């Protein structure tokens, strides 16, 4: 079927690497057929390593180019 087999990764702690050289790290709970993610406890990794905290975020599917686990399935 069309959904990504992302079911494994849920509630484990992800890093993402986003289009345009951006990085965010997250505990995950969402996916839909386009891979639109809903990330929780989401940190923004700025260029300089000055880190922000931000709340729950949606991501557009096409913006992702990798999706990595910081703590295992």
């Amino acid at each position: 079927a069309h959904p990504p087999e992302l079911k494994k990764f849920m509630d484990k702690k992800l890093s993402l690497k986003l289009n345009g050289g951006r990085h965010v790290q997250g505990i995950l709970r969402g996916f839909d057929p386009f891979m639109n993610l809903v990330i929780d406890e989401c940190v923004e990794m700025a260029t300089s390593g000055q880190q922000n905290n931000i709340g729950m975020v949606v991501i557009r599917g096409n913006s992702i180019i990798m999706l990595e686990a910081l703590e295992r399935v």
Partner: protein
């Protein structure tokens, strides 16, 4: 439906060791686990080469389909009953 010969060879590739290069220029080298019909791969136990030289090891990774621009499938597959 006519999902042709290449994606079947991708499913055939699973459980081996494949190399996989993304738009940005990062080169991954990892053991495959599953691959979907739009080429979303999961990959395990990777040694990644960065664009500028550096190596790193990784636990597990999932690589969006449209973001790839080759895989290096393991040569023994040339015999496979898809071909």
């Amino acid at each position: 439906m006519s999902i042709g010969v290449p994606i079947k060879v991708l499913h055939e590739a699973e459980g081996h060791i494949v190399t996989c290069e993304t738009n940005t220029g990062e080169v991954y080298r990892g053991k495959l686990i599953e691959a979907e019909d739009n080429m979303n791969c999961q990959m395990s136990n990777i040694t990644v080469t960065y664009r500028d030289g550096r190596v790193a090891q990784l636990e597990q990774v999932y690589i969006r389909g449209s973001k790839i621009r080759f895989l290096i499938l393991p040569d023994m597959l040339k015999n496979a009953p898809m071909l």
